[PDB]
Amino acid sequence: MQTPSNKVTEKGKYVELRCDPISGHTALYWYRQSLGQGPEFLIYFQGTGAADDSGLPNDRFFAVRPEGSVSTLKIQRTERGDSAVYLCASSQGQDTEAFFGQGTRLTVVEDLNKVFPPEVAVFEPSEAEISHTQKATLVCLATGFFPDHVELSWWVNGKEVHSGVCTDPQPLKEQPALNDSRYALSSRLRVSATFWQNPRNHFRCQVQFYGLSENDEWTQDRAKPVTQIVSAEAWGRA
Amino acid sequence: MNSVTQMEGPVTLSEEAFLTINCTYTATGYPSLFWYVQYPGEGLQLLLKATKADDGSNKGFEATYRKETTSFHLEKGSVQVSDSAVYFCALSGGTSYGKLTFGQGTILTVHPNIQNPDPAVYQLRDSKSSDKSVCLFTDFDSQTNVSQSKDSDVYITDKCVLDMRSMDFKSNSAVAWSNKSDFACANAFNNSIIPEDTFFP
Amino acid sequence: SPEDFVYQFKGMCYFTNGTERVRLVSRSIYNREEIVRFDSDVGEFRAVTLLGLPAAEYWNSQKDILERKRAAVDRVCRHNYQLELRTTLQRRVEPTVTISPSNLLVCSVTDFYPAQIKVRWFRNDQEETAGVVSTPLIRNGDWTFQILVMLEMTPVYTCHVEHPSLQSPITVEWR
Amino acid sequence: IVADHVASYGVNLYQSYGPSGQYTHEFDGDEQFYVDLGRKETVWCLPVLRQFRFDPQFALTNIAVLKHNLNSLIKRSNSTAATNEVPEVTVFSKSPVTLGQPNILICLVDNIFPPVVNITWLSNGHSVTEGVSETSFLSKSDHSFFKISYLTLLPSAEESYDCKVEHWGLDKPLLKHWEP
Amino acid sequence: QPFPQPEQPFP
Ligand SMILES: *[C@@H]1O[C@H](CO)[C@@H](O)[C@H](O)[C@H]1NC(C)=O
Ligand SMILES: *[C@@H]1O[C@H](CO)[C@@H](O)[C@H](O)[C@H]1NC(C)=O
């Protein structure tokens, strides 16, 4: 229901979160889920007009739903405390079935210099595993990115697969003593030995990174870490 | 006061184990109680609910509305590995216009019963031969825990549970890598108590 | 004249014999025409006019809406009646009785509560039931009532007043 | 419907003219309390009722649900607006009139629809602002309304009073007289 | 305390 999966913003600037409810649902609810907490109510729309604004924390928060369809939640002068997942639910009223969206994860960054895109690399399976278990395990490494805004996926012969994939549930700090440390992530695709040994099968590890936008002023010689995709490929070996 | 206080702390179970997630509430009037599950990578979705007293059952999960103890405890007699998610106990009153009062979540992780373990540590090579080389600790029992390395330039991930759905065979695995030119696959995972029979190619 | 579009919603409770007989009626009104109604004796929404058919039809298809509406007799009407038993129902305001001459006689019974009252005219210990014209009960609006009872007289007259807030009826004499 | 006591546990009102709203509770035709939609506070009209607490946010959200329903009927009913009514006005005193003794004048404006009315007091032709108060729009089974305005005074033989009522159903402002 | 009746939204 919600248009951006993750968004990065600099302190002191505004953000806009969008929610497109299911067609015909007149009631719309905004929630906020901080880390290690449950969702908390923000605002409730009934049609084009706002019905309950008690959940908004301060005056920097403001929402609107012109046309009584899409709703926009605007946070001004963002702080590091506004970093959470902003959920959106829609229904036809109370005591009717409510449907929740995937949510948008907002991360407020203090300094833009700390943002980095990931670096993807795929590793071919070991000949010892193929000879011992008759199965091949591919490993994909995504290193050197900040913040935690990556979506990893495997693509076998141009089609996204889900069977036999193992992505770590939580990323890994490359230096845990630092509060703004670069992250690392690994994923595992496991196929049969016969499938990997076919020189016609194509494997590609794809990572979707969410970063800076056009409104963020980048003033450094390094390439701008905008939203992009980093991929790594490998062909089957006989 | 409209509050929901449920269990905290990660709940860790094995296959076919009994699950219980307590949830107590305090509400002024007559509320409706809910249970929400958030699977990894997905959003919230309604698991079960209840609207009157002494009244939900979806996917084998079971919860009974009890006004005597103001409770809505969740229970499952035989948990599955696919139940690993976060469970939220919710509440909505008759004057709340469908607004939901959630509680903190309860993380659940179900360990698979590896019936045919073949643990080993294999070394992999880069497709570009650039970067570095990683090593894979895989096919070990769920009774094995992986520890963080001692060298500052060595990264070791946690256990991930892979499910080859073409064979209904689950297996744990962990990854470790390092740029150090003296990184050996037999010397990694040495801060961890690995199985004795761990095959070292 | 500027045009106006009015919408009203009345959640009403009717009490008889205290809590023995309780009835709930929800009324959705467009301008002055009730379009959708939930009667507790019916058990589901009823479209009073064709304009409220899509609303009543959809609301009766949601089992959770009908459940909350059916339980409202006990959760709203009977619950609030417990609070009325120690506030509005207890209210007792003693009436102030006054007789003024302006061949007529005006017995002014002012500022009392509740509305239950009886005023009778006596002439030498004889109830005068003719020549007595009584105004309707006047609602002051501030939780008090008043009433004026006229007497067509031709010259002791006493005004008899009975009210629940009194231990003994009040009598006021003229001439 | 016949009953011993009638209670409107929810008199909700919303009209399109200058987006106006009202939330009151009634019991036996008397107003228990009203929620100030601008200040977000519950105002009790009987002192014994101040021991209770009623969340004013409910009234705000409920009126917003009426606003959504009304906008739907404006489209569906092909814009059928409200019809104006001819209100009846009556002026009287709360207690018997004695010169010099504190008293209150009561102006009752009945059969009000739409609920848009101006009620003012006049003393010998000039306007009176101090000591004036009124109720809300009290509901009737006719689905119309009626409002009552009050005026505290010390009655004397030199001051007459008028109640000036302005309504769309009147061809000219209605004045009702009162004298001691 | 005083418990009210909410209005259901139109579909
Ligand atoms: C109220 O009580 C009287 C006698 O106590 C009875 O005759 C009457 O039917 C009752 N009213 C209702 C509505 O049941
Ligand atoms: C009440 O008086 C105000 C004064 O500004 C005026 O604008 C309004 O139209 C009047 N309302 C009616 C119904 O006469």
Short mmCIF file of C-alpha atoms in Angstrom, two decimals, chain C residues 11-159:
data_model
loop_
_atom_site.label_atom_id
_atom_site.label_comp_id
_atom_site.label_asym_id
_atom_site.label_seq_id
_atom_site.Cartn_x
_atom_site.Cartn_y
_atom_site.Cartn_z
CA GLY C 11 -28.35 7.46 19.92
CA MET C 12 -31.43 7.21 22.12
CA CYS C 13 -32.35 5.04 25.10
CA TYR C 14 -35.90 4.50 26.37
CA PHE C 15 -36.44 3.37 29.97
CA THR C 16 -39.65 1.99 31.49
CA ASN C 17 -40.02 0.53 34.99
CA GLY C 18 -36.40 1.55 35.49
CA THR C 19 -34.21 -1.16 33.97
CA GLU C 20 -37.00 -3.75 33.55
CA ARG C 21 -37.74 -2.48 30.02
CA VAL C 22 -34.91 -0.85 28.04
CA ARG C 23 -35.01 -0.02 24.32
CA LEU C 24 -32.28 1.45 22.11
CA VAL C 25 -32.92 3.28 18.82
CA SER C 26 -30.16 4.78 16.68
CA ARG C 27 -31.32 7.40 14.18
CA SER C 28 -29.41 8.69 11.15
CA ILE C 29 -31.18 11.77 9.80
CA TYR C 30 -30.59 13.70 6.57
CA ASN C 31 -31.97 17.22 7.06
CA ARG C 32 -35.22 16.16 8.76
CA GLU C 33 -35.78 12.69 7.23
CA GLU C 34 -34.59 9.67 9.20
CA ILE C 35 -32.90 7.42 6.63
CA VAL C 36 -31.31 4.59 8.65
CA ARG C 37 -32.45 3.21 12.01
CA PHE C 38 -31.23 0.48 14.36
CA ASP C 39 -34.01 -0.66 16.69
CA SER C 40 -32.98 -2.98 19.52
CA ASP C 41 -36.28 -4.87 19.22
CA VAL C 42 -35.56 -5.55 15.53
CA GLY C 43 -31.93 -6.61 15.91
CA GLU C 44 -30.53 -5.16 12.68
CA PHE C 45 -30.41 -1.96 10.66
CA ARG C 46 -33.56 -0.89 8.80
CA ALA C 47 -33.68 1.62 5.95
CA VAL C 48 -36.46 4.07 6.75
CA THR C 49 -36.24 5.62 3.26
CA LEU C 50 -34.76 4.46 -0.03
CA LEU C 51 -31.86 6.89 0.43
CA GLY C 52 -30.50 4.78 3.29
CA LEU C 53 -30.72 1.38 1.60
CA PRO C 54 -27.01 0.97 0.65
CA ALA C 55 -25.98 1.96 4.18
CA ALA C 56 -28.35 -0.45 5.96
CA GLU C 57 -27.61 -3.29 3.54
CA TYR C 58 -23.84 -3.07 4.01
CA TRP C 59 -24.01 -2.63 7.79
CA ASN C 60 -26.12 -5.78 8.13
CA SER C 61 -23.42 -7.71 6.22
CA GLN C 62 -20.74 -6.98 8.86
CA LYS C 63 -21.17 -9.41 11.76
CA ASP C 64 -18.92 -7.31 14.00
CA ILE C 65 -21.00 -4.16 13.49
CA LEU C 66 -24.27 -5.90 14.39
CA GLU C 67 -22.63 -7.47 17.45
CA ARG C 68 -21.53 -4.10 18.82
CA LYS C 69 -24.93 -2.56 18.04
CA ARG C 70 -26.92 -5.37 19.68
CA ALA C 71 -24.87 -5.25 22.90
CA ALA C 72 -25.37 -1.47 23.17
CA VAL C 73 -28.59 -1.94 25.17
CA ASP C 74 -26.56 -3.34 28.08
CA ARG C 75 -23.26 -1.53 27.47
CA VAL C 76 -24.66 1.98 26.88
CA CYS C 77 -28.28 2.34 28.00
CA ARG C 78 -28.21 0.11 31.09
CA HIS C 79 -24.70 1.26 32.02
CA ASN C 80 -25.53 4.98 31.90
CA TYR C 81 -28.79 4.43 33.81
CA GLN C 82 -26.69 3.49 36.84
CA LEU C 83 -25.17 6.97 36.75
CA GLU C 84 -28.60 8.58 36.33
CA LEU C 85 -29.76 6.86 39.53
CA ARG C 86 -27.42 9.09 41.59
CA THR C 87 -27.57 12.36 39.62
CA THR C 88 -30.49 13.40 37.42
CA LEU C 89 -33.10 11.06 38.92
CA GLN C 90 -32.23 12.11 42.49
CA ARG C 91 -32.61 15.82 41.69
CA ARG C 92 -35.28 17.33 43.95
CA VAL C 93 -36.02 21.07 43.77
CA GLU C 94 -38.80 22.35 46.03
CA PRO C 95 -41.25 24.70 44.28
CA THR C 96 -41.80 28.29 45.40
CA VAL C 97 -45.53 29.06 45.58
CA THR C 98 -46.84 32.62 45.21
CA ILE C 99 -50.34 34.06 44.78
CA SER C 100 -50.93 37.43 43.09
CA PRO C 101 -54.31 39.06 42.39
CA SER C 102 -53.76 40.40 38.85
CA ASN C 103 -61.11 39.20 39.85
CA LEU C 104 -58.48 36.60 38.93
CA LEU C 105 -55.86 34.69 40.93
CA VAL C 106 -52.45 33.52 39.69
CA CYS C 107 -50.78 30.78 41.73
CA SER C 108 -47.18 30.88 40.48
CA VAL C 109 -45.40 27.57 41.10
CA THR C 110 -41.81 28.27 40.06
CA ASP C 111 -38.48 26.44 39.95
CA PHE C 112 -39.06 22.76 40.75
CA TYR C 113 -37.77 19.35 39.66
CA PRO C 114 -38.81 16.76 38.64
CA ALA C 115 -41.76 17.61 36.39
CA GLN C 116 -44.24 15.59 38.48
CA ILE C 117 -46.60 18.06 40.16
CA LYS C 118 -50.29 18.66 41.00
CA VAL C 119 -51.87 22.09 41.75
CA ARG C 120 -55.41 22.39 43.18
CA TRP C 121 -57.49 25.44 44.08
CA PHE C 122 -59.45 25.46 47.35
CA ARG C 123 -62.21 27.89 48.36
CA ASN C 124 -63.13 27.53 52.06
CA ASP C 125 -61.87 23.92 52.18
CA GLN C 126 -63.74 23.12 48.95
CA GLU C 127 -61.86 22.16 45.79
CA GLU C 128 -62.80 24.56 42.99
CA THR C 129 -62.60 22.58 39.74
CA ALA C 130 -64.45 25.14 37.58
CA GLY C 131 -63.04 28.48 36.52
CA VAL C 132 -59.52 27.03 36.77
CA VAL C 133 -57.45 27.34 33.58
CA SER C 134 -53.89 26.02 33.84
CA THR C 135 -50.98 26.84 31.56
CA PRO C 136 -48.96 23.93 30.13
CA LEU C 137 -45.80 22.83 31.90
CA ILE C 138 -43.05 25.36 31.16
CA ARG C 139 -39.49 24.04 30.80
CA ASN C 140 -37.10 26.71 32.07
CA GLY C 141 -34.14 24.94 30.46
CA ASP C 142 -31.85 25.01 33.52
CA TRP C 143 -33.26 21.72 34.89
CA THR C 144 -36.24 23.45 36.53
CA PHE C 145 -39.92 23.81 35.65
CA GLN C 146 -42.66 26.31 36.41
CA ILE C 147 -46.43 26.46 36.00
CA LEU C 148 -49.12 29.11 36.51
CA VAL C 149 -52.67 28.19 37.54
CA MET C 150 -55.43 30.75 36.99
CA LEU C 151 -58.61 31.06 39.05
CA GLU C 152 -61.77 32.87 37.98
CA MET C 153 -62.99 34.24 41.31
CA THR C 154 -65.77 36.52 42.54
CA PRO C 155 -65.14 37.79 46.12
CA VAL C 156 -60.08 32.53 52.06
CA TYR C 157 -58.54 31.08 48.87
CA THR C 158 -55.70 28.58 49.23
CA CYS C 159 -53.42 27.10 46.56
#
